[PDB]
Amino acid sequence: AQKSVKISDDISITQLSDKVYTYVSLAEIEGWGMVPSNGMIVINNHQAALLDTPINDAQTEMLVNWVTDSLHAKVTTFIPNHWHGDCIGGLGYLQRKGVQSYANQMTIDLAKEKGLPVPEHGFTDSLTVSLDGMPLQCYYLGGGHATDNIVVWLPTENILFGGCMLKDNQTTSIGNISDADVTAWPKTLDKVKAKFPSARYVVPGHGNYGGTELIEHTKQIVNQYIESTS
Numbered sequence: 196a197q198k199s200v201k202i203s204d205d206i207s208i209t210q211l212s213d214k215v216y217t218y219v220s221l222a223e224i225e226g227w228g229m230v231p232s233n234g235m236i237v238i239n240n241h242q243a244a245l246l247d248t249p250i251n252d253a254q255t256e257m258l259v260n261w262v263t264d265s266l267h268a269k270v271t272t273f274i275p276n277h278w279h280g281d282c283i284g285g286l287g288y289l290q291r292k293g294v295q296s297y298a299n300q301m302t303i304d305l306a307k308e309k310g311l312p313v314p315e316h317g318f319t320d321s322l323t324v325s326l327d328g329m330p331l332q333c334y335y336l337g338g339g340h341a342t343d344n345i346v347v348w349l350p351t352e353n354i355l356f357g358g359c360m361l362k363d364n365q366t367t368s369i370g371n372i373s374d375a376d377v378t379a380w381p382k383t384l385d386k387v388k389a390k391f392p393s394a395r396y397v398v399p400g401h402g403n404y405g406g407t408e409l410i411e412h413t414k415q416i417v418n419q420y421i422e423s424t425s
């Protein structure tokens with residue numbers, strides 16, 4: 196069991212640790228109706244790192260003030276998982292609040308071509324940003340749900356922000372695969388299960404959070420759809 200607090204009505208936080216909370220932001224992502232989105236809020240010493248924002252700026256600006264008022268951290272760092280509304284959907288807000296963003300370089304080149312706000316720090320494989328001594332370990336383990344998708348590993352917290360390459364234990368859906376690397380994903384999770392075999396929490400990019408079975412579960416999903424289309 197773990198605390199489920201509502202900031203708005205359509206915005207929930209769930210605290211998995213002393214320095215890490217996770218929320219789901221339901222918003223309307225155009226073309227699919229009402230989708231529930233995930234994100235990590237990570238607090239070290241009044242400094243707040245945010246791992247993906249909601250669909251627009253309003254909820255970015257909903258979650259960002261709550262994390263002021265109640266956690267008395269200033270959001271100063273951000274990391275989108277890929278370039279989807281569900282990742283940087285609300286980065287327009289946050290660069291304006293001068294937040295410093297880090298992401299996959301691929302995702303940087305991408306957003307640019309589609310003309311979205313652009314993160315300012317890139318990497319090609321791994322990049323360990325410090326929230327004041329708190330390593331916040333981002334990696335590019337390969338493409339999946341999308342080509343630029345990455346994972347963030349909180350080394351002190353054994354918390355793995357799996358992202359949209361992962362699905363919950365509850366869903367058996369490949370969801371939205373327009374910018375995917377299907378033949379390729381299957382082997383990303385494989386790498387991901389190998390690197391954080393010891394992750395206590397492994398949260399997806401949608402769906403409820405879990406353990407490391409979320410990995411073997413998503414893989415299946417993917418093989419069931421590859422094996423069922425190819």
Ligand SMILES: CCCCc1nc2ccc(O)cc2c(=O)n1Cc1ccc(-c2ccccc2-c2nnn[nH]2)cc1
Pocket residue numbers: 224227228229230231279281340359363365366368369370371372400401402403
């Ligand atoms: C109507 C669409 C399906 C809704 C849904 N609802 C859920 C409810 C509970 C839950 O635990 C999981 C889901 C879920 O995965 N989904 C699937 C879902 C699938 C894709 C999307 C979506 C929409 C726009 C851009 C990217 C995505 C995306 N799809 N997969 N990962 N990310 C959004 C939601």
Ligand SMILES: [Zn+2]
Pocket residue numbers: 277279281340341359
């Ligand atoms: Zn996505």
Ligand SMILES: [Zn+2]
Pocket residue numbers: 279281359400401
């Ligand atoms: Zn997504």
